Amino acid sequence: GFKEYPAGEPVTMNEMELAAVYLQPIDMEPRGMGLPAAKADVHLEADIHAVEGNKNGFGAGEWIPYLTISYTLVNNDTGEKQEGTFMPMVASDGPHYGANIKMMGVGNYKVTYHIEPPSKAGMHRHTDSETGVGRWWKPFDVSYEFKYVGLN
Amino acid sequence: GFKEYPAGEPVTMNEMELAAVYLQPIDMEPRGGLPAAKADVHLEADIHAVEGNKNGFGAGEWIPYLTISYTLVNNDTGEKQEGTFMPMVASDGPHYGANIKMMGVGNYKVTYHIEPPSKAGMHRHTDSETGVGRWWKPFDVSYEFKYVGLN
Numbered sequence A: 001g002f003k004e005y006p007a008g009e010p011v012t013m014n015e016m017e018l019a020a021v022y023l024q025p026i027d028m029e030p031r032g033m034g035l036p037a038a039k040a041d042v043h044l045e046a047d048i049h050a051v052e053g054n055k056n057g058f059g060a061g062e063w064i065p066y067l068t069i070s071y072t073l074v075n076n077d078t079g080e081k082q083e084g085t086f087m088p089m090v091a092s093d094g095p096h097y098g099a100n101i102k103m104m105g106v107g108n109y110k111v112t113y114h115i116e117p118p119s120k121a122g123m124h125r126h127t128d129s130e131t132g133v134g135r136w137w138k139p140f141d142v143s144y145e146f147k148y149v150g151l152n
Numbered sequence B: 001g002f003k004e005y006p007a008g009e010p011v012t013m014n015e016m017e018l019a020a021v022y023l024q025p026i027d028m029e030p031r032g033g034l035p036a037a038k039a040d041v042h043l044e045a046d047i048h049a050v051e052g053n054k055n056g057f058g059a060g061e062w063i064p065y066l067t068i069s070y071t072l073v074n075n076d077t078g079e080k081q082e083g084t085f086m087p088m089v090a091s092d093g094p095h096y097g098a099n100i101k102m103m104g105v106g107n108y109k110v111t112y113h114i115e116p117p118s119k120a121g122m123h124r125h126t127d128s129e130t131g132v133g134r135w136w137k138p139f140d141v142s143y144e145f146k147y148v149g150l151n
Helices: none
Strands: A005-013 A017-021 A042-052 A068-075 A081-087 A087-091 A094-101 A107-116 A140-148 B011-013 B017-023 B041-049 B066-074 B078-084 B087-091 B093-100 B104-113 B123-127 B139-147
Touching: A017 A068, A017 A140, A042 A068, A042 A107, A081 A094, A094 A107, B011 B066, B011 B139, B017 B066, B017 B104, B041 B066, B041 B104, B066 B123, B078 B093
Parallel strands: A087 B123
Antiparallel strands: A005 A017, A005 A140, A017 A042, A042 A094, A068 A081, A068 A107, A087 A094, A107 A140, B011 B017, B017 B041, B041 B093, B066 B078, B066 B104, B087 B093, B104 B139
């Protein structure tokens, strides 16, 4: 513990369930072009797993690897917005996507994740009839509404 | 189906299980590796966590972001081939593999040269609160098998 904070409601899309969480800023290796733990306010995460009936070769509950994800963070109260990128991470609870980020004060935030399929990071689909899977979904957006008062 | 054939004995190291299998050559996107027409097999590395894994992966879960090359040798002739796998996903799930042209029927040894997820751009949490163990050093694993054409 390792206390983590819900960012809004999980959404089911493209036979995946996609959630947002945040927690204390984390130290990572290799490091790194973002912000060090110190400079950051939180570590923002995307939790993305296949559900039942996944067309792309993933079983129910399995982590979806090789995604390319960027974020748009909006403080709805002040209208201040920030952009950036996540990386693939592994922690004591498993794989996720994320970034140490600077927040923009107390507020009612909207976070949009811009998601591209595993093809854009070099994971290759079998396509033959015998061993192949469904075509990749198009790049898409998912959003989350949450309140932030900082940690503790 | 999708009919696959084991290549050697699976081996346990660095808290993983590492097996080899091959099957008919496959089609990959993008259209343009060796085309199915110019290959004899699709050779794979099957790599999953086992209980007690020190790097954040639950027993049974695929190890993602590996960098894998291979040396394949026909022991009958001593002829060698060197190549690299890519990360793939097929109907039964993800793996690491490549369409390969073999060096005849015979007795084979294939070695996989495995680098940790760090090299492919996965980042491990290092802090006490959320962190896991150091990555293993790059290592080799080899598999002895008979190849007679498929099959």
